[PDB]
Design a binder for this molecule. Structure first.
Ligand SMILES: [Fe+2]
Length: 311
């Protein structure tokens, strides 16, 4: 339980201390990306700056582990979190509130939360996860072609470009899992093995408040290494770093960030998947993200020539 020992270590807040400086803000190497793999027009279309200005990092003993500090164009974060909270939750996809709350109670989430923010505990505070594409059955720990809703296009294009730049051009976005946090929310010690195609990488996107991650080998026995994950930061776990045990011990609060300080531009490209945000949407997103953090994992389920067995 060495991983759990560091998990309880950092779980003791201790902000701005020896603990704050024991992590790896952005052993450390730079990962040569491929500015040739993507064009600034598609990256503008999805709100990421030219790969020529991206910086990627890896660590010794963790090959294929890619950390990329915030590459998002200034302001783009706002759209992604918005669609994360305003759109991706409701009826077509699946969230945790579907188990004991009916679709009528959940459909009125955004507007009733706007009335709640205007009036000054609602459901958006109670959100814990959303699944996109092939809906992960938590109980079964399996995927199924039977439980499926179409993967959001813009999100898929994002994951596709990022995975292309990181060296996997044949990446179709099939499974999505968007974790939502409270301040005290955590993510447990686990490996990410529910998929059938392990070759394709796991694409994590951090937002909201800063958080502390961890990276340990396939055996939970191997002690973890700890690093930050600010808003906009992106982890691409590939090759070896895909069967590696990881967690999120804390959402560290404000000593909302600076990437949220910079707003959207009025002029966005005509083919851009980055989209406009009404003002009260960044109001509720801005408050909720002053409270806590969001995470966006994207995954390949099936290999290119593989399909779910029948039996
Ligand atoms: Fe995970």
């Amino acid at each position: 339980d060495a991983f759990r020992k560091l998990f309880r270590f950092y779980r003791q807040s201790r902000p701005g201390t020896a603990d704050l400086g024991a992590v790896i803000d952005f052993q450390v190497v730079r990962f040569p990306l491929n500015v040739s793999s993507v064009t600034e027009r598609d990256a503008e279309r999805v709100g990421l700056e030219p790969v020529s200005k991206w910086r990627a990092y890896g660590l010794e003993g963790y090959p294929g582990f890619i950390f990329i500090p915030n590459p998002f164009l200034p302001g783009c974060q706002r759209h992604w979190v918005k669609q994360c909270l305003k759109l991706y939750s409701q009826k077509p996809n699946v969230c945790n509130l579907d188990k004991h709350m009916t679709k009528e109670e959940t459909q009125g989430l955004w507007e009733q939360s706007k009335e709640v923010l205007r009036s000054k505990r609602s459901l958006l505070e109670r959100l814990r996860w959303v699944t996109l594409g092939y809906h992960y059955n938590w109980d079964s720990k399996k995927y199924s072609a039977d439980h499926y809703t179409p993967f959001p296009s813009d999100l898929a294009f994002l994951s596709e470009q990022v995975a292309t730049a990181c060296g996997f051009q044949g990446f179709q976005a099939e499974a999505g899992i968007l974790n939502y946090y409270r301040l005290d929310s955590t993510l447990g010690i686990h490996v990410d093995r529910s998929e059938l195609d392990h070759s394709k990488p796991l694409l994590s996107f951090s937002f909201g408040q800063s958080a502390i991650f961890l990276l340990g080998g396939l055996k939970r026995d191997e002690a973890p290494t700890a690093m930050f994950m600010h808003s906009g930061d992106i982890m691409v776990m590939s090759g070896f770093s895909r069967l590696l045990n990881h967690a999120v011990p804390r959402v560290l609060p404000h000593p909302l960030p600076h990437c949220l300080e910079t707003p959207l531009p009025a002029v966005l490209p005509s083919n851009s998947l980055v989209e406009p945000c009404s003002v009260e949407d960044w109001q509720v997103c801005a408050t909720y993200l002053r409270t806590a953090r969001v995470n966006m994992t994207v995954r390949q389920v099936l290999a290119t020539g593989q399909d779910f067995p029948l039996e």
